[PDB]
Design a protein around this ligand. Sequence first.
Ligand SMILES: Nc1ncnc2c1ncn2[C@@H]1O[C@H](COP(=O)(O)OP(=O)(O)O)[C@@H](O)[C@H]1O
Ligand SMILES: Nc1ncnc2c1ncn2[C@@H]1O[C@H](COP(=O)(O)OP(=O)(O)O)[C@@H](O)[C@H]1O
Ligand SMILES: [Mg+2]
Ligand SMILES: [Mg+2]
Ligand code: NA
Ligand code: NA
Ligand code: NA
Lengths: 229, 229, 464, 464
Amino acid sequence: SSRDLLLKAKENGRKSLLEHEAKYFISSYGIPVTNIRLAKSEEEAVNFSREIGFPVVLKIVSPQVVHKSDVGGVKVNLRSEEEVRKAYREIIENVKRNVPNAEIEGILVQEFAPPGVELIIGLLRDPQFGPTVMFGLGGVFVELFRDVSFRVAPLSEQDAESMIKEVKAYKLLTGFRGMEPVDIEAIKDALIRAGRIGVENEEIAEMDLNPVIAYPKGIKVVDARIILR
Amino acid sequence: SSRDLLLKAKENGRKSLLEHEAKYFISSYGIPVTNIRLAKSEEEAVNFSREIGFPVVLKIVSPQVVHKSDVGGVKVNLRSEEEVRKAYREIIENVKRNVPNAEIEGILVQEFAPPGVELIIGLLRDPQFGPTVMFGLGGVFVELFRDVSFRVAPLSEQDAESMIKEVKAYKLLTGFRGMEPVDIEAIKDALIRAGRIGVENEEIAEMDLNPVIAYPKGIKVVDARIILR
Amino acid sequence: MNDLERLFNPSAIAVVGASKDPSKIGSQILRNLLSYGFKGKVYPINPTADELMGLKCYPKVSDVPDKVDVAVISVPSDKVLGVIDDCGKAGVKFAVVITSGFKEVGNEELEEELVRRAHSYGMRVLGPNIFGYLYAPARLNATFGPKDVLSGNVAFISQSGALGIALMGYTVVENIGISSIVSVGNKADLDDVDLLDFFDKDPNTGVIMIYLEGIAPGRGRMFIDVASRVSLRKPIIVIKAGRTEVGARAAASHTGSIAGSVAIYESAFKQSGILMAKSVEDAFDWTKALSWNPIPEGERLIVLTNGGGAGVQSTDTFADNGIYLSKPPESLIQEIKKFVPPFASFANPIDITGMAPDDWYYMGTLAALKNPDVDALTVLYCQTAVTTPIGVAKGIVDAIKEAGNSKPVTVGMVGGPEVAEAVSFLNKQRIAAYPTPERASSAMSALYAYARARSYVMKSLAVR
Amino acid sequence: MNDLERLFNPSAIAVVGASKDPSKIGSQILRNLLSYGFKGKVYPINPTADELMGLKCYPKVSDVPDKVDVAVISVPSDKVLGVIDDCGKAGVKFAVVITSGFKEVGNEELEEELVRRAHSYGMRVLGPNIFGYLYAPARLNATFGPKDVLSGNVAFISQSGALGIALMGYTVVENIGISSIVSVGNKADLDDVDLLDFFDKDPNTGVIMIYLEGIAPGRGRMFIDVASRVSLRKPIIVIKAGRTEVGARAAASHTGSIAGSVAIYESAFKQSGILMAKSVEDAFDWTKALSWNPIPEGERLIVLTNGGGAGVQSTDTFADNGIYLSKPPESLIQEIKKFVPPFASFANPIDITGMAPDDWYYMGTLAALKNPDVDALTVLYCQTAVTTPIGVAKGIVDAIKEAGNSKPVTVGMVGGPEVAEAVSFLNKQRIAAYPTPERASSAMSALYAYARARSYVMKSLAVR
Ligand SMILES: Nc1ncnc2c1ncn2[C@@H]1O[C@H](COP(=O)(O)OP(=O)(O)O)[C@@H](O)[C@H]1O
Ligand SMILES: Nc1ncnc2c1ncn2[C@@H]1O[C@H](COP(=O)(O)OP(=O)(O)O)[C@@H](O)[C@H]1O
Ligand SMILES: [Mg+2]
Ligand SMILES: [Mg+2]
Ligand code: NA
Ligand code: NA
Ligand code: NA
């Protein structure tokens, strides 16, 4: 069961899931994620990279490193075996130097998501209303302008569709200069599932799917955070 | 006098200024524009590009071509002589195909403006209120969301400052993730001057400074359109 | 424990805290109970008095030789627990604790102890810190507020005591017919969810209006489940206190709590099919319209006016509420062209011009309402010397009667003291009338807003 | 040509179109002129009548043995030009053309001709298609509307005829004192700019309220220049008709025009220092407060309430208007703690609790107003049996008198019929009172909005 991921984390006193565990967990609820593999050797990493296909992304996996970018732990758009081996050793040291007191679970091999319209899907727990789903456009639209919609879970299709149409940046999803319309049904579908995750899993305090990239067909969660309580 | 440009256009039956004439015109009012040079031969184009320095931009100059991008008439970020000569002939033909017989005035050589926060400054004539200045953030903020402010000209400093603070995307100017605050005084200054252009020049029906790139220090008008009546 | 039938329709009520002193709260409550005409047994409870207001008095509820359903308790806070024990001994189902001095002043332990004790006896608590309650179908006025309200189908629930009791009086001035007033105050036990469950089932109640400051932690999901289901049949208007960030922090301290999320309350009200009013006036204006009209069956709203200006005010106000007018049906236009001058406008609003006499209002209103392709009507009147406000109002009344149907109608009349009387006349006929075109249009917009809210809920309950 | 002194203060007025028939427009106007008490000469003009209403009648204005300042013209549209020529020969300065049937019905040529002919005689035109005008300081009622208004300092200009004449009546109900009513209708010649110039210089006029549908092409810049300077000393409230995209297209057809830009009108009003009202009720509520109060000199606004609920409604409403309350001055808190219970709240609003008797309203209001660190006061009252509305109101009045100063005050009272009367008592004393807390707060908000609008203008006029 995917709950084994939550139970394992609680057993080891951890209050959040590692990146790969969070993607496994939401993937089991039917939310599309970047294809991933946990590599334990530079050799595993090349093999997994070929399986997944180029270009790939490599990320350090460690309970200590919560912000991978801010320690040289993220290598994006690797298109060759050599670029992979280069990124591998380089991440080992970028993190070995900035955090020498750090436990590596390994290095995540990950599919490189091509550019699209970025979204945020959140789950929070409101004191009155319990699990609540949050939606907004990615980047400055949520971070700077706070343009978000909320629905209390569980979400009906009607909730998911109206909360999408409600945000001020909604038009970024229906086609604009240099960008085709994106898959609104896939977004609705993920919002509903996000709500289901919140209703069902009491131990999940908070979840943040960010960035989520929307395409003319389908969406892909690129990063996922799950906090436990 | 810069008015000679307006008189010249009216004498030749044209109802808009060419890009270089428009930039020269607004420059004379103290609005910063790209350094520019009109090239009539591929050799002129290479020679001017050296003078200005790399990287450069090449644009078709033709009374016929009002939308240069949409006909393959704009070549951005050219860093070498070879890239320039390629762009020269490429534009000649991109435009020869979509626009035959066009009276080419030449090809405009201009410096490639570094990235910044894009703005739009407009001037229109309202039937009630006459010359009116329009402000907004560039890209989707005006084009898709219609997030714009207006002040009837002439503008006071109070008008310019308040119309900037009024647009919903205003925080894009005061610093956000990966972008420093930009020069608000320079924006205010350009807005007042745009108003002065409208008050003083009856024959100008409409003006569109788009994009205007704002920096931590100063702004630069990258494209300018002036419509005559 | 969860059925409130005997709270609203008790056979026996005890009033604890009444005395020979007419200024005591308990005495005010007792006076109201008698004057409003309660037909069950009333038992004043007082340590020494042999009789109060002609009724045999007892020292304790447990001494009453009867099953007491409801005990209205008005004694000092340090005596309440004792009275609760006695009510418990007597088998009392509901303790209406008027008395203040509980959690709202920091005494949270006393308040929780109150509820704990009441629950140990299978008793529910309303309040504490309330002005009581009224239920018109049981001729029950157990408040110390005004002695009377107009009878009707509106249930009003208030978390605020002073504003609640004031609004209780204001319903008379605004001609709002009331089925119930419930002061819920501290909401330590019985809350809005419990009450909504009762008013859902009450055939006397058709509209519910709530002054709400906040909902308890962990209670919001149930609030949506219940309210959304009530909304399918009865409109709920909430006046939300603390609907701005600033106000939410303020009200947080007024009740001694942490600030609820503005945005999430708004989403919860949308999921509930609830209409949120930003003001008392909006709430009352909407309540009137919702109480006296069915929901429109479609979007064919007609605005009828004797002046372009009122019509444009109306068009703008509808537009602000996402309501857009479309061309009237040709049949209606032809009917009206029979009497109207050539330069009347039929774009919708239908402008029958400023020279329109009283009779054109009767004819226009009748024609509009009888037309099978008209779903709703807002009638606007600007007073001119060519007309009389009361003649226009009686024309509207007559047209509504003769049309026979029930299509939603609101009326906006502008003018001097004669319009004020005509508007009053209409509201006393239960025709929703207002002294400006924007308020009549905002009132009609509430009918549409409720239709759309109900549709939101229906869609959200759709089977997969 | 541009000085309107003799329009508002004429020595002689001719009424063209008056007759023995009392139902005629000209006859109604003549009646109002006489009943309202005009002290100048009135000359009824009628082809055959020897006398009308005790006044010598003449067949033409040119036969009048006197200099006629103003001719009020209500003859059929196809006779107007003739009357204009006669008035021109007679040297008439102002032609008040009541008569409709001009550009508003598609006859644009006739209207342009009307103005051309009037101008060839140095004569100005008001209208056409208007209900006339009133100027209270000249005891001049040259309208066919109500016969009377309350005297005061509000000038009301209306582009709408039916709504305009109705609002003339509504001012009485809302206790608004009027200096002038001007119907401008088709605005073929004299318009808002011309009127604002006159009202700028009129010491009888302190507030200007305009119902505005549109401004003529090429007139807007001058509108901003004049209105902005007027705004420095006198508030201007505009009810903008067609203030939505939808409504703008609607009103475009009502007057036969091209649709003005909503956004640019809004910026023009901001640059003019004008307050834009979205409704009649807002416009009138604000006009009352602005008419009876000085602008606040700082941001130290105090809200005084006997109920937390009303206080939170007020706080939310101020917040919607960008007005944020801050902690009261410590001296005021201490002054009030002298009589108030321990669990009163002093966060601002100052909650003197629901137990407050009448006199606490006198004492709190007085303390607030005398405090040197208080700039403005909104007083909120919820009716309870502990108080009387009229007693609370008299306490507020007494406090305002004894404080002696002029700080802005608004009052919100909620309750039954006794509150309605107390509110009427206050407004008849020219203390701005309203029946809900949100309206009292929105009215106070208008005083601050005007202070901020005036500041916008002062800043935009700064010399560099
Ligand atoms: N697989 C991927 N495909 C595409 N872009 C990616 C991928 N992984 C990361 N990125 C980008 O790189 C950024 C940094 O990585 P991220 O997962 O957010 O780690 P952290 O926030 O801990 O630094 C992301 O916000 C995203 O924009
Ligand atoms: N000098 C320049 N520096 C930087 N970017 C430029 C420059 N000229 C053009 N661009 C970019 O290329 C785009 C297209 O060029 P532009 O002058 O707007 O032509 P058009 O709008 O006719 O297609 C601009 O919107 C801008 O993003
Ligand atoms: Mg990140
Ligand atoms: Mg461009
Ligand atoms: Na309260
Ligand atoms: Na239609
Ligand atoms: Na209180």
